[PDB]
Design a protein around this nucleic acid. Structure first.
Lengths: 10, 10, 10, 10
DNA sequence: TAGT
DNA sequence: AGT
DNA sequence: TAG
DNA sequence: TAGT
DNA sequence: TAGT
DNA sequence: AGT
DNA sequence: TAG
DNA sequence: TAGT
């Protein structure tokens, strides 16, 4: 996720 | 930092 | 730091 | 001393 | 007293 | 002086 | 009473 | 935010 | 450096 | 850590 | 070469 | 599978 907590997605 | 981006500190 | 130049940390 | 713990002296 |  |  |  |  |  |  |  |  995020970053942070990529995306999703990418 | 955070986490993220601990604290600081700890 | 150190001392000298505490820790880090403490 | 040092610095630290200048020189001495200077 | 000097002088990180 | 030495996130 | 930092050295 | 810390602790010679 | 410690510490999602 | 966060199909 | 995250912060 | 993915991409601070």
């Amino acid at each position: 996720t995020x970053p942070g907590v990529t995306x999703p997605g990418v």
